[PDB]
Design a protein around this ligand. Structure first.
Ligand SMILES: Nc1ncnc2c1ncn2[C@@H]1O[C@H](COP(=O)(O)OP(=O)(O)OP(O)(O)=S)[C@@H](O)[C@H]1O
Ligand SMILES: Nc1ncnc2c1ncn2[C@@H]1O[C@H](COP(=O)(O)OP(=O)(O)OP(O)(O)=S)[C@@H](O)[C@H]1O
Ligand SMILES: Nc1nc2c(ncn2[C@@H]2O[C@H](COP(=O)(O)OP(=O)(O)O)[C@@H](O)[C@H]2O)c(=O)[nH]1
Ligand SMILES: [Mg+2]
Ligand SMILES: [Mg+2]
Lengths: 332, 327, 330, 257, 352, 258
DNA sequence: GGCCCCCCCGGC
């Protein structure tokens, strides 16, 4: 509706709206007529369409009437301790399947099992996870398990072995452009050539972020009230991308090599609010793609950037990390 | 033990020491004569050294050994002493003293007190040993310094290892409850840092002061939270911002004018309190936060008692608004 | 179950029912058969990695010993159930100290996944095991031996379940193909074994996914391309090309090749790193520090990837680490 | 509806449900034309409870096809407690039911309560475990058995029952002491309910746990007499006869060593 | 009331800096029905909270500024009763779960879901008495939340999208997890320029009747604020109060006590490098930490004061910054702040 | 200046006990007409309205309307120590920081008068303008207890449906589902167990276990309840007093599927 | 007899 965000408004409803996950969507569709759906483990980067995919599968399998009575969904917002897993999940799995109505049996396949969707399974403790090993196996004939996670390493080996793994690929401009273009036409958003491709490139495998950026750009254009097409500079500004001029000044200061000047420039730069991750990514792109540096310089800078990114991913101060990275690069 | 605290000053305290080897020699010789087994006097002391002041334990030892061995001489004293050695967990001070000794970390000492022995010593009290090590590793004269290494470098290495052990401890007590890492925490927190500064203590061993500091910081944070939520309706900031930026400016209005206008600044202070929903207890808490050269204890004490009495009377003689109801 | 067994997943549909359907554990199977054929059945400790068939083996042994009505004559406790000190004290002791109900026989207790049990329960079970040994026997299934107390280990005869050999997996695959009327190319079989890592559950899951992927299973043969598409794993040719470009080509073209290979089929960086590690493990290096640097840097990169982060930076780091490590060869 | 069973009084079903709720957790009911049967096995796999209720215990009973219903006894007891002790209880089930409907209807008013309990998938058989010719059988008032069990369970957790020539002996050996109770069969023609009967083929000596006997004697409120049947190499049978059905407890004797 | 609080703007049209951000906020508030979840990030003391309040006032009526404080009770797994101070408005809600430490997740799993799972009674500006709009919840200092709370929020912000909207303000996005960033609309708030700060200070001075011979006075305050506006206003107020409401060209810049303590520590470490000096630094660190001074701020200020020493060389500064970078991560992954601060100080003293 | 001599102090005790859990800080406006109060729940989801008319009090008089924000928990603390049969009065003065509760009795010995502190609670111009509510009825409270306590153990929803000649309580959950239907039933010998119901359009609204359980805890105040349900307005549960009543406007839960 | 609540280890 008009009172919902575009990310939720254009959420897939069926399995035919999934764009770049055909390798698993085809298997899921075949399971509709095969009726032998196994335990599933959906893993991949954020914003790839895993929860949407499982919701669409459950809808197409059961119907809006049987969805409530055949699906049990537990996520990180509910207590999922060992006791909860041993009591509630066990009781639901061991229960008999709800009796479908003639309407549902006529218009839906109505598979003879229920589904438990453990979203954000990577947040569950190992002890709690170990309690499901026999639960899934014993009641496989009446219940099926769907574990959705972002880090596959957080799932214990027995559960990964029991579940069938499904990897969701990143959504880039080469496979997710069609959906973004369709959304743009539906919303009557006018954009210049390459704007959607730039949005998808900035998103880096996150269609939700791209949709949010498109919505923000459309809102800005509507508020402007000029009718001009959306450009790429405005999109970059809305995405927090550092201007190329600032990057040029940064690399020139690094090439200068003076510690005091670099420190002063970093102090001035950090007052603008630019995210450290974006700066590091832009610096990595510029330095790696440049042909004016030798093999050793790139060899060292790659490791330096990797270390800086790893340290930043732990939630540290951006100023200190950025200053250290720039100082190290200047001494390469 | 803390459970004995209530008995601090309500009973006559009578302390019994471990009997000396000469106060029980006659009794033990009499027992040996009565039981018809030879007991060489020259080896008697070691028995107490084996039993460590326990007359009951040494009597039981004699009773057991005399069952089949009728002679107790220097030929078999070593075997019985080794077999009947009593193991008692050391106290945190004793643990710190022993772990910070350079003898055990030498080539010859290591063969007697092994790494497993040090880990067991740590495990005797795993809730206090890391704190004692972190507290008492800066007051030693190391004797195991590497050729060319200085005391400061060893101290820095020990501090880095202590930080790593702190990270390990934080991971141990997380939601995963990874207690299997406790042995690792033994090395990263106590054994390794002590192995770099092992030697002779430069002074008395001091109990860890981190607990009192933590309690004081918790109390200070509670008072800061109370003040922040009392002034939330007026300020646009968090408790951290309130402490770092707002408190000096507030002092400029709630303490400074008492030192210049005397008792004539009561009305302005009360007006500020009403504007920011502050109370006298909040005033005391705020004036107690400052550190460095801006301490307010001496300044507050030097304030004339008449001014403080008048301020209290004025505060208690009028109604004040309340920000939070039923706190 | 519901309806028929055809609706069950292949992992559960093909669960062995008898002991002769367990493959890759000939020694253990023969030993247990001999034990149950002449009455000398001791306490068992089946230690092994996931997907070896320990639970299936013990279930088949119980069925052979007791028969069809084996569920009512054995006490099966697993991690899904509450197994505390009180449970061991009361329920297990009563089961071990009481006669059978339906028919004459000895009492069997199967503590599956006992590695998730508390130390107090394990300590309590010692005297229960050693007191009712005449009429009761204990079987414990484990994946990690460090979670079991030494006292419990001392009272059980240890049997280790090795990873499934190649021939056993081929035989099971042939049986599954016969049952499902499916055809598999030899290269597809080799790829399946390579990616299987000795787990039969992975074999069954990947085979089911491949069957679902086929346009028409009646007259379509699964090839290596189908397996790679279903699992999304990189092809060996792509790994070889990426390694060649990294080793000999310069920075720009190596980066371009890696990006193109990854974007062609949406490959993941961790699988590429794993394949490169497998390929380089067979390289006859002339120096040791080169291998040390390779292993350390690749382990660091894998650990960083496990927690997420920027993928492009991680790939550049992989390339730089490989180049720097191979620079030491001279 | 397909299966519709009407009870004369909800208390009639409630008392039988309460008679064995404290010893088993999961129950399976098979409803047919002859009546309703059920067997439950406790977690320790030591005690088996077998209940049968005939059509004569129901006002109106209709069952076209056999129905298998898996339930949790705790949930069923809770729902029965939710119902009153003066309303009419109706068991309602449909083909391949996913739930069982308990209908409480009050004749005085127009209040109808319809509770639904989700059924449970418990795939198991009955095996009709019953020894053709037990070594010995006996029958005696339930109150006396309950008193003896409660008295002898206060001394020890194990009770030994010996059947020999014209005598039944219950022995408990504990820490504080020991106790023995001996009863000889006799027939009274003026209070037949208090008579004790015994028919033996071979002497018997079997040991049982005190907790299981304590839980078994809890069904003394459903009958005035209890029949105990003992047989070597066979579970001991404790039968309480109902108005038109019966309740049975099969208890495995402890291993002798 | 303090000047920093009395002159706070209460509307989007009253903002005096970052006009582009004001235009973006106006565009967002033009059609607030489809407003996505918002995440504001930028330097501290720039006006992120003020801009959020202005946006709320643009969306709802002026009544968003009538605030109340209530107390909520929570129970943990150990039957521990915890109190949370909740700041509420008839049109919006404000919460700071970090005040409950590792228990912040409970607030996500008990409070927010209570508000988002069902409707509200709106007897004002309505005909039926039920609300016909969404509620805006402001989670202050989202960077301080634990990972579990964010994971719980992941589905909460999605399955109640059109009933509740979240506006999260933070000074850094590094602690924020990727899923939360993906689910939020990023808004960058740059710090005001020196000229804008000087103009605001001049307006305050001219509206407060403060004598000022030269405007350059205010300029210095801006160079002493490093982009912070709240600090600038507080420093101006303190200077006015310390100089009899008359700023002079010779008036010094008033620094807070903790900054002076950190400077003392820095110039003691530089001058003296010994174990006894490290013990004295331990005492100083205990004193600093016991009085509600965050460890991260202490480390940052100590590092940036060490780097400002005119006697140290390039190699010493590089070693100091490397050690600071390592020990910042150590602090982020540790509990005892001093356990890492002492290590950093020891490493710095060794490298000098 | 103001007195509210009660016919029975237990009546006021039950009145206060009926909404102590829902709200704790409520403004009481004491006009010559009677006592009026309306407090918004701290979550801005439940409105506790209340009014006691002049008829209920044994002797009520006031010279100038006054609003008192006096607490409720302290009210319970004061009233719990009192006897059963008394004539509580609420005397105050021109500038009351406290209100003297005169616990008068017919006998001159059983007197337990106390003093209750007053506290400044802000009050707003809230409105309860009537709407065309689809259904409204009244029925005893014992049935409410027997139904709510029964359904709470099976689910967290006490969904209420009001159809012609039918009143349905529905509660579904993990264990199962439970539905109880009550219908117009009048007893000539016992009129108290009767339902007085009038509906215009069908209505169905899902309500929560905790809210209704708390409400029925305080249902000892009035032996009869009042249901009022609409289609777009907050349905309200009322407890009739001697001359006034105690209303509870509770917002219905949001429906995601519809 | 059953909840409900509080204190205390947790590696080999
Ligand atoms: N394959 C997709 N096809 C179409 N839209 C998608 C797709 N994936 C994501 N989106 C869009 O982005 C929005 C969010 O997708 P999500 O289902 O939340 O991704 P996700 O994989 O669940 O993210 P995580 O791992 O739980 S943080 C959807 O409502 C869609 O509008
Ligand atoms: N030796 C085997 N022969 C045939 N199939 C096997 C074999 N081992 C495992 N499988 C297959 O994989 C499925 C699971 O085997 P499991 O018995 O569950 O392995 P497991 O060792 O018990 O796993 P863990 O150690 O409890 S995680 C079986 O149903 C079989 O279909
Ligand atoms: N005149 C004016 N003052 C502002 C503006 N924005 C912020 N301020 C002032 O700066 C003070 C601090 O801003 P604050 O909201 O706390 O920033 P935050 O803590 O980073 O979110 C505020 O109390 C205001 O007085 C503005 O746009 N115009
Ligand atoms: Mg999702
Ligand atoms: Mg298994």
């Amino acid at each position: 509706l008009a009172q919902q965000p575009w990310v939720e408004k254009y959420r897939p409803k069926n399995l035919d709206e999934v764009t770049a996950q055909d390798h698993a969507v085809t298997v899921l569709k075949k399971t509709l007529k095969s009726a032998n759906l196994p335990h599933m483990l959906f893993y991949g980067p954020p914003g790839t369409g895993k929860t949407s995919t499982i919701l669409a599968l459950t809808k197409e399998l059961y119907g809006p009437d049987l969805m409530k009575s055949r699906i049990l969904e537990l996520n990180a917002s509910d207590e999922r301790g060992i006791s909860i897993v041993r009591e509630k999940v066990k009781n639901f799995a061991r229960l008999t399947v709800s009796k479908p109505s003639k309407h549902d049996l006529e218009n839906y396949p109505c598979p003879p099992y229920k589904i438990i969707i453990l979203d954000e399974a990577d947040s569950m403790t190992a002890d709690a996870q170990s309690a499901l090993r026999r639960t899934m196996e014993t009641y496989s004939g009446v219940t099926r398990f769907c574990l959705i996670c972002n880090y596959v390493t957080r799932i214990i080996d027995p559960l990964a072995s029991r579940c069938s793994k499904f990897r969701f690929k990143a959504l880039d401009a080469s496979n997710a452009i069609d959906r973004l273009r369709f959304i743009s036409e539906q919303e009557n958003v006018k954009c210049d050539d390459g704007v959607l491709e730039r949005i998808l490139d900035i998103s880096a495998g996150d269609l939700r972020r791209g949709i949010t950026l498109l919505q923000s750009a459309s809102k800005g254009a509507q508020y402007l009230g000029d009718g001009k097409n959306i450009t790429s500079t405005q999109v970059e500004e809305l995405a927090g991308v550092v201007p190329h001029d600032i990057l040029i000044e940064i690399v020139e200061k690094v090439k200068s090599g003076d510690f005091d000047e670099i420190k002063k420039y970093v102090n001035t730069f950090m007052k603008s609010g630019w995210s450290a991750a974006s700066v590091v990514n832009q610096l990595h792109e510029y330095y790696i793609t440049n042909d004016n540096f030798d093999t050793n310089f790139k060899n060292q800078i790659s490791w330096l950037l990797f270390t800086t990114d790893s340290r930043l991913n732990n939630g540290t101060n951006e100023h200190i990390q950025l200053l250290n990275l720039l100082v190290k690069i200047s001494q390469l | 033990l803390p459970k004995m605290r209530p008995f601090d000053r309500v009973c006559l305290d009578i302390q019994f020491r471990r009997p000396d080897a000469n106060s029980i020699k006659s009794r033990l010789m009499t027992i040996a004569i009565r039981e018809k087994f030879k007991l060489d006097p020259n080896v008697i002391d070691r028995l107490i050294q084996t039993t460590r002041g326990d007359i009951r334990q040494v009597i039981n030892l004699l009773s057991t050994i005399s069952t089949t061995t009728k002679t107790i001489n220097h030929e078999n004293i070593n075997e019985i002493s080794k077999a009947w050695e009593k193991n008692i967990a050391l106290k945190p001070f004793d643990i710190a003293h022993k772990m910070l000794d350079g003898q055990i970390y030498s080539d010859i000492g290591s063969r007697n007190f092994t790494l497993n022995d040090k880990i067991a010593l740590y495990f005797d009290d795993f809730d206090f040993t890391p704190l004692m090590i972190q507290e008492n590793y800066l007051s030693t004269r190391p004797s195991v310094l590497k050729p060319g290494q200085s005391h400061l470098e060893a101290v820095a290495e020990a501090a880095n290892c202590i930080s790593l052990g702190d990270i390990v401890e934080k991971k141990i007590r997380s939601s995963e409850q990874l207690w299997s890492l406790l042995p690792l925490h033994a090395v990263l927190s106590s054994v390794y840092p002590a192995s770099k500064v092992a030697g002779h203590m430069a002074g008395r061993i001091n109990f860890t002061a981190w607990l009192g500091q933590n309690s004081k910081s918790a109390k200070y944070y509670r008072l800061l939270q109370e003040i922040h939520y009392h002034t939330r309706l007026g300020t646009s900031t968090d408790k951290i911002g309130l402490r770092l930026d707002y408190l000096p400016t507030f002092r400029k209005r709630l303490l400074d004018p008492f030192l210049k206008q005397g008792a004539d600044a009561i009305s302005s202070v009360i007006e500020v309190m009403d504007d920011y929903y502050l109370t006298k207890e909040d005033w005391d808490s705020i004036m107690e936060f400052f550190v460095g050269p801006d301490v307010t204890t001496a300044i507050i004490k030097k304030i004339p008692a008449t001014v403080k009495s008048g301020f209290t009377r004025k505060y208690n003689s009028m109604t004040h608004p309340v920000a939070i109801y039923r706190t | 179950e519901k309806r028929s067994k055809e609706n069950l997943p292949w992992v559960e549909k093909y669960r062995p029912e008898t002991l002769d359907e367990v493959y890759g554990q000939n020694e253990v199977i023969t030993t247990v058969r001999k034990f149950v054929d002449e009455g000398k059945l001791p306490h068992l400790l089946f230690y092994g990695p996931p997907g070896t068939g320990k639970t299936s083996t013990i279930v088949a042994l119980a069925r052979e010993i007791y028969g069809k009505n084996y569920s009512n004559m054995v006490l099966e406790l697993n991690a899904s159930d509450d197994r505390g000190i009180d449970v061991v004290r009361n329920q297990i002791k009563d089961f071990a100290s009481t006669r059978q109900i339906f028919s004459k026989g000895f009492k069997l207790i199967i503590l599956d996944e006992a590695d998730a049990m508390t130390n107090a329960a394990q300590n309590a079970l010692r005297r229960v095991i050693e007191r009712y040994t005449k009429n009761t026997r204990f079987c414990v299934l484990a994946n990690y031996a460090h979670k079991l107390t030494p006292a419990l280990l001392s009272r059980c005869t240890r049997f280790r379940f090795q990873p499934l050999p190649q021939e056993a997996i081929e035989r099971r695959i042939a049986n599954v193909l016969v049952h499902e009327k499916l055809k598999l190319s030899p290269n597809a079989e080799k790829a399946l074994i390579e990616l299987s890592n000795g787990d039969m559950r992975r074999v069954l899951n990947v085979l089911q996914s491949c069957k679902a992927t086929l346009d028409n299973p009646d007259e379509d043969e699964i090839s290596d391309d189908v397996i790679y598409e279903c699992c999304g794993a990189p092809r060996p040719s792509d790994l070889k090309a990426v390694l060649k470009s990294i080793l000999e080509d310069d920075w720009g073209t190596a980066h371009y090749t890696l990006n193109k290979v990854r974007s062609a089929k949406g490959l993941a960086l961790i699988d590429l790193i794993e394949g490169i590690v497998k390929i380089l493990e067979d390289y006859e290096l002339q120096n040791e520090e080169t291998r040390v640097h390779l292993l350390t840097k690749l382990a660091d990169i894998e650990y960083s990837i496990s927690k997420g982060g920027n993928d492009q930076i991680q790939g550049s780091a992989v390339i730089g680490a490989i180049k720097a490590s191979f620079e030491n060869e001279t | 509806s397909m299966l519709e069973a009407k009870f004369e009084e909800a208390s009639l079903f409630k008392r039988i449900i309460d008679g064995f709720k404290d010893c088993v957790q999961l129950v399976n009911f098979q409803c047919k034309e002859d009546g309703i049967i059920a067997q439950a096995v406790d977690d320790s796999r030591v005690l088996l409870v077998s209940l049968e209720i005939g059509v004569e215990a129901f006002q109106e009973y209709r069952c076209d096809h056999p129905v298998t219903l898996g339930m949790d006894l705790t949930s069923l007891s809770k729902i029965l407690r939710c119902g009153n002790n003066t309303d009419t209880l109706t068991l309602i089930a449909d083909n391949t039911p996913d739930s069982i409907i308990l209908l409480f209807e009050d004749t005085k008013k127009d209040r109808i309560a319809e509770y639904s309990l989700k059924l449970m998938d418990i795939d198991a058989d009955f095996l009709k475990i019953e020894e053709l010719q037990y070594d010995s059988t006996l029958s005696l008032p339930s109150s006396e058995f309950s008193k003896i069990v409660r008295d002898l369970s206060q001394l020890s957790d194990s009770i030994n029952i010996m059947i020999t020539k014209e005598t039944i002996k219950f022995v408990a050996d504990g820490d504080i002491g020991s106790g023995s109770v001996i009863i000889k069969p006799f027939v009274d023609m003026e209070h037949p309910e208090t008579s004790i009967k015994l028919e033996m083929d071979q002497p018997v000596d079997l040991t049982f746990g005190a907790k299981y006997l304590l839980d078994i004697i809890k069904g003394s409120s459903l009958s005035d007499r209890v029949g105990i049947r003992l047989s070597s190499e066979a579970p001991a049978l404790f039968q309480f006869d109902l108005k038109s059905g019966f309740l049975q407890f099969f208890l495995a004797p402890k291993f002798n060593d | 009331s303090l000047w920093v609080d009395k002159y706070r703007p209460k509307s989007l049209n009253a903002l005096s800096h970052n006009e582009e951000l004001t235009n973006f906020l106006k565009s967002l508030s033009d059609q607030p029905r489809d407003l996505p979840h918002l995440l504001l990030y930028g330097p501290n003391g720039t006006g992120k909270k003020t801009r959020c309040m202005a946006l709320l006032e643009s969306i709802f009526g002026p009544g968003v500024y009538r605030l109340k404080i209530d107390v909520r009770q929570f129970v943990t797994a150990s039957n521990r009763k915890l109190e949370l101070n909740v700041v509420s408005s008839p049109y919006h809600l404000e919460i700071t779960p970090s005040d409950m430490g590792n228990n912040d997740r409970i607030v996500i799993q008990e409070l927010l879901k209570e508000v988002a799972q069902m409707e509200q009674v709106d007897f004002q500006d309505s005909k039926d008495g039920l609300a016909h709009r969404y509620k805006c919840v402001i989670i202050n200092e989202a960077n301080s939340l634990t990972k579990d709370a964010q994971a719980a929020l992941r589905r909460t912000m999605e399955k109640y999208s059109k009933n509740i909207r979240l506006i999260m303000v933070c000074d850094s996005m590094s602690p924020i997890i990727a899923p939360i960033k993906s689910r939020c609309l990023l808004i960058r708030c740059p710090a005001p320029s020196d000229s804008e700060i000087s103009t605001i200070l001049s307006d305050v001075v001219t509206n407060e009747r403060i004598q000022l011979e030269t405007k350059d006075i205010l300029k210095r305050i801006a160079q002493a604020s490093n982009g912070n506006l709240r600090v600038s206003l507080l420093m101006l107020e303190s200077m006015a109060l310390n100089n009899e409401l008359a700023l002079k060209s010779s008036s010094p810049i008033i620094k807070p006590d903790w900054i002076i303590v950190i400077h003392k520590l820095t110039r003691k470490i530089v001058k003296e490098r010994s174990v006894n000096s490290l013990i004295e630094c331990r005492a100083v660190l205990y004193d600093l930490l016991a009085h509600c001074i965050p460890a991260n701020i202490i480390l940052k200020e100590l590092t940036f004061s060490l780097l400002d020493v005119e006697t140290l060389n390039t190699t010493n500064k590089s070693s100091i910054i490397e050690y600071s970078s390592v020990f910042d991560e150590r602090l982020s992954l540790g509990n005892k702040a001093i356990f890492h601060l002492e290590g950093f100080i020891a490493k710095v003293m060794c490298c000098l």
